[PDB]
Amino acid sequence: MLTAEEKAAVTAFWGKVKVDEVGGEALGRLLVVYPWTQRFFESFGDLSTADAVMNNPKVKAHGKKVLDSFSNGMKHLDDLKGTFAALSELHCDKLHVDPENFKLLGNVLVVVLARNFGKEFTPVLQADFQKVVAGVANALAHRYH
């Protein structure tokens, strides 16, 4: 996990991230970029086109939930395994989400932050952030590991 710095930086940056917005774009991009992921969101309705996906109310709403868990995860960078324990159970045991997918989402999230913050999302910050999403991907993959 992060050290004092990585953490603080990661932290400070996060304070500027509009979860609502960013979460809907992150989930949406996942379904667009790695389309097999749509299989898990069948109930979401129309995912027929990229526009349909990005504009789907279920996608957007679910995206916000995802980002909330991330924000929580950001408060407990110390214990990501503990914090994600329930989700680990859901995703692994009940949903059977191949863990490879957790990585794709974390990566898509970083792309999204880069998009929304431009240069402000520095190579150095990006890096602490890669640590974070890898930690989250590992916590969720626990019922595998």
Binding site: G28, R29, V32, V33, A50, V53, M54, N107, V110, V111, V112, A114, R115, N116, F117, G118, K119, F121, P123, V124, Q126, A127, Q130
Partner: protein, 141 residues
């Protein structure tokens, strides 16, 4: 395998990159070495310091090969045979590295072309980068 929409998206996005190709190519390398330090073990003879003129110059070369590939979307294997030889045969780069670089490039592009880096363009470029990656890790000689 790319669709016709995929090719359209790649040509158009790469078109917007224009004269900043080298710069983006350099930033992608810097982001890669910084985020995934294991990548650095492929360049032991390089100064991987901040702003190394070596990295910047390497960035230029990587960007020129991508331009070449954009110009040859229909015959990557043919277009990149020499690079496959290097990366597959000589260097023996583990294919996971290509993923790290592809990611690194997408992060760079999104940050520099936010209004152009649409969900559709994002999908098409990701696929294009996986195709290049396949060629570069294949020994078809």
């Amino acid at each position: 395998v790319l669709s016709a929409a995929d090719k359209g998206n790649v040509k158009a996005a790469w078109g917007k990159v224009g004269g900043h190709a080298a710069e983006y190519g350099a930033e992608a390398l810097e982001r890669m070495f910084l985020s995934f330090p294991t990548t650095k073990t492929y360049f032991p003879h390089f100064d991987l310091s901040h702003g190394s003129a070596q990295v910047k110059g390497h960035g230029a070369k990587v960007a020129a090969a991508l331009t070449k590939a954009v110009e040859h979307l229909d015959d990557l294997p043919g277009a990149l045979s020499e690079l496959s030889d290097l990366h597959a045969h000589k260097l023996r780069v583990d294919p996971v590295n290509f993923k790290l670089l592809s990611h690194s490039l997408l992060v760079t592009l999104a940050s520099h072309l936010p209004s152009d880096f649409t969900p559709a363009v994002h999908a098409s470029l990701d696929k294009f980068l996986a195709n290049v990656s396949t060629v570069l890790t294949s020994k078809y000689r």
